[PDB]
Amino acid sequence: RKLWAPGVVAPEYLKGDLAGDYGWDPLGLGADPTALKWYRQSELQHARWAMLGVAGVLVQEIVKPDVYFYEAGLPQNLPEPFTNINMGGLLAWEFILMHWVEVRRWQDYKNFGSVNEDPIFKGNKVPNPEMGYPGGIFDPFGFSKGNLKELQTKEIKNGRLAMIAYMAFILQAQATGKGPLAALSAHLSNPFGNNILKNIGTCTVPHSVDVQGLTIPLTCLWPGS
Template sequence: MKTAILACLLSSAAAFAPAQKSAKTSALNAEMSKSIPFLTAPKNTAGWVGDVGFDPLGFSDYFDMKWLRESEIKHSRAAMLASLGFMVQQFVTLPGMPDVDDSMLAPAAVGPSPMLQIFFGLGVLEFWSNNGKVTIENMFSDSSRVPGNFGFDPLGMAKGKSAEAMADMELKEIKNGRLAMCAIGGMMAHNIVTGEPLF
């Protein structure tokens, strides 16, 4: 009986002993995301310009980060142009084009020809920018290729810049692009919901 009681006491005391560290506890010590504090920071976005730990769906775990960054930059640039065009076209009409106050009606007003020119023109640009490679697997087969850098700098803004200055310019482009993606979505939603021009 005394032996059984002693064994019970020793086993209950073992429950209060410090647990051995294992690989399972490392997840609890993981760095948390800056943008979503209740999620762990994505490991594959670290070191990229503009990283704030925002990848709630874990895209960076399944896709090449170069491809993801290229996609973000292209969508950002398109959104910046779209946001500007959405506002400007309410005040400026190109020669030979009908005057349209409602930006959402512009494609129907100008007809299919200009829209097809844009579609095929951008298709050729995409084909050229990817050197004819259109899949994720071989898009960055050239390891020296930098996402979003197509050598287009007519104003020479990148000449003579240090690595820190270039990183600062890239950060500004990413931030403005992210804002523009939200902005064009908001402008289109406003137009659809209210049925009125932006201004």
């Protein structure tokens, strides 16, 4: 197995069972096995939400380049069918739906193989071969019968890359005031101008933007003013 660095002995609790295992854990937070399981679930959740977020920013920049994603949540920028929607009700929808699904998944964490069964239409079920990869209706096309391992590694690697690139999206979104592709094209405008050496230190985000009734406090990741 290739390591995360040349000439580094691998830890004893990282053997190769999990995917994307390079033996890299300098802080040793995965010493406890239950900790290793819960943090594995954390890595999978972060990977998958981050991949969705990266594709979201990218495709919104490809399709309609007017939508600046960092400002896209304000209640007047939303698309065709509704443009003055009450954010309280929208928050209610999101709250109930996401609560149901995430509480269900947590219950799958505490008791392995206990919430597979459909509570309403009782002849439905999904077989999870490993914890965190459900399958079944979550695999409507069935790409998960060839060894499943290389697809685990591909998923987790692409996810790590997506997490880093998404924090890039937010960071240079707050530094230079432009989206991702706009920043790439503006860097291809002149490479020596428009650099990190010049644009940082200026954090173009407002202090507190107003939504319909309340005032959200806003923070940038580093004090630039």
